[PDB]
C-alpha cells in the first residue's frame, strides 16, 4: 500500500515504425523497466537476508 500514482505518460507501444523519436521512446521506457527490475531484486534480497538473520 505504498504505491505512487501516474496519470499521463508517453506511448510505450508503437505500430508504425518511425525514425529517431520512436527509438528514443523505446529506450527511455526500457531504461526505467530494467532499473526498477534491479531495484526490486535488491530490495527483496536485502530484506530476506535481514529477516533470516534476525530470526
Amino acid at each position: 500500500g505504498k504505491t505512487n500514482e501516474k496519470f499521463h505518460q508517453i506511448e510505450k507501444e508503437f505500430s508504425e515504425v518511425e525514425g529517431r523519436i520512436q527509438d528514443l521512446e523505446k529506450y527511455v521506457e526500457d531504461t526505467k523497466i530494467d532499473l526498477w527490475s534491479y531495484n526490486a531484486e535488491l530490495l527483496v534480497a536485502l530484506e530476506n537476508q535481514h529477516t533470516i538473520d534476525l530470526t
Binding site: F7, H8, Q9, E13
Partner: protein, 58 residues
C-alpha cells in the same frame, strides 16, 4: 495545398490535412485564405488534468 492524385479510399481520391492552433488569453486569431480552406466552426476548451488515452480490448 498540393494538387495531386492519391489512392482511393471510399471512392474518394482527395485528402484533407488537419492543423490545430492554440490561442492564449488576450491573443487574436487571424485566418486569411484564398481557397482550399476547411474553416473551423468553433473553439475547443482545453485544460490541464489527470486525463489520458489508452488502447485496450477489455
Amino acid at each position: 495545398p498540393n494538387i495531386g492524385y492519391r489512392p482511393r479510399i471510399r471512392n474518394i481520391p482527395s485528402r484533407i490535412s488537419i492543423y490545430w492552433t492554440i490561442v492564449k488569453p488576450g491573443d487574436i486569431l487571424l485566418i486569411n485564405s484564398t481557397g482550399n480552406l476547411i474553416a473551423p466552426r468553433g473553439y475547443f476548451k482545453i485544460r490541464s488534468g489527470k486525463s489520458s488515452i489508452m488502447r485496450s480490448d477489455a
